[PDB]
A paper describes a structure:
Poly(ADP-ribosyl) polymerases (PARPs) are a subgroup of four enzymes (PARP1, PARP2, PARP5a, and PARP5b; PARP5a and PARP5b are also known as tankyrase1 [TNKS1] and tankyrase2 [TNKS2], respectively) that continue the reaction (PARylation) to generate long chains of linear and branched poly-ADP-ribose (PAR) on target proteins. PARP1 is involved in repairing single-stranded DNA breaks making its inhibition an attractive strategy in oncology especially in those cancers that have defects in additional repair pathways. Thus, TNKS activity promotes Wnt/β-catenin pathway, and TNKSs are potential drug targets for the treatment of cancers driven by Wnt/β-catenin pathway, most notably colorectal cancers. We determined crystal structures of the catalytic domain of PARP1 and the ART domain of TNKS1 in the absence and the presence of the ligands.
PARP1–talazoparib complex structure is similar to the previously reported structure. Inhibitors stack on Tyr907 in PARP1 and make conserved hydrogen bonding interactions with backbone nitrogen and carbonyl oxygen of Gly863 and the sidechain hydroxyl of Ser904. Tyr889 of PARP1 is seen offering van der Waals interaction to the bound talazoparib. In addition, Tyr889 is also poised to make edge-to-face (pi) interaction to the fluorophenyl group of talazoparib. In addition, talazoparib makes a specific interaction with a conserved water molecule. In all structures reported here, a structural water molecule is observed (except for the olaparib-bound structures, where it is displaced by the carbonyl oxygen of the ligand; see later). This water molecule makes hydrogen bonding interactions with the imidazole sidechain of the catalytic His862 and the backbone amide nitrogen of Tyr896 in PARP1 and analogously with His1184 and Tyr1213 of TNKS1. Talazoparib uniquely makes a specific interaction with this water molecule through its triazole nitrogen atom, which serves as a hydrogen bond acceptor. This feature could afford talazoparib its superior binding affinity for both PARP1 and TNKS1 relative to the other inhibitors. Also contributing to the superior binding affinity of talazoparib is its rather rigid structure with two rotatable bonds, which is recognized in its low-energy conformation by both proteins, unlike in the cases of olaparib and niraparib (see later).
Author numbering: 662 to 722, 726 to 744, 748 to 750, 753 to 780, 786 to 1010
The structure:
Amino acid sequence: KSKLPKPVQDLIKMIFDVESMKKAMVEYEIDLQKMPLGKLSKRQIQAAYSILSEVQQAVSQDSQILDLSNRFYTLIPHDFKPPNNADSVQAKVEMLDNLLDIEVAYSLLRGSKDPIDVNYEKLKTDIKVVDRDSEEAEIIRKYVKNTHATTHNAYDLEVIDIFKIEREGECQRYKPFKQLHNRRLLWHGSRTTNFAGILSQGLRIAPPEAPVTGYMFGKGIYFADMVSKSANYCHTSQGDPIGLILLGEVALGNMYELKHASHISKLPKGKHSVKGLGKTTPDPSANISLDGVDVPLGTGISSGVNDTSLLYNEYIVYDIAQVNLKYLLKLKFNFK
Ligand SMILES: Cn1ncnc1[C@H]1c2n[nH]c(=O)c3cc(F)cc(c23)N[C@@H]1c1ccc(F)cc1
């Protein structure tokens, strides 16, 4: 019998759900016999990324293009006829990203005591419940409620549980950025099946093999100041309407503000982050400070920037150590 609070136990079961991993694979139409959950390998996936890079290049740039599409399907077996377009190549990339974390999740799970407590320990994260009556819960609730975008109206968000999280070794890694100017509490959403990898390894940057297309500001860690922009990356459906979103303290420092896409390979010297300027910004006057970190929880208003490719802000760091994960929210998506 696990001594852990029931919301923490429910979180572990949700993270380490094999049925969820298998369901995701069934939806991606992967052959579960030719490519079972336990046989997905990093080497196979990284090599598939490379073929998708050799593919997106031919589309950007027919015997050798079919031979590249066919060599990909040989590498990542599917069961269908097998279906140009960088958006389809980016879908395969995202599938491979989900497949990797699905592999990590299964790897931890498979690789005396209650299975819930044993699986908790594999996450190397200290997970505590934030009380509904606390000042932190109130601030977090206000942040969810106010930063829901007017354009994003496919669902309503409801906070189920708020967890305070301490990833093992992240405190040590963060130390150089601890006193940096412009530290902000920002959103990061992901598929529930990715949270085993995120808690055990932290938020990561896409490998060099992975195609850069899709990464507007290049390969880094992306954050939003509007909950609905990050909540979309949960990919919640009416079927599975419960998602997980992070609140991270991000050491932005001096921001390289951009109004359009730019594949950052090296920031301008003296700059520590990119801020993609959006048309709508959370009201800066309502900006509060939760334990010395800026919390942009104001309601969505015009930033004045009409000359931009973005509707809402996004923040990107290019060093994993600039992120200190603080909270994990369990959100109910109530679709309209
Ligand atoms: C899909 N993905 N994989 C890693 N990071 C992400 C996204 C992302 N995840 N989560 C967020 O909360 C977020 C909040 C933003 F304002 C902006 C974001 C994100 N863009 C990231 C993005 C989008 C498309 C793409 F092709 C590559 C990267």
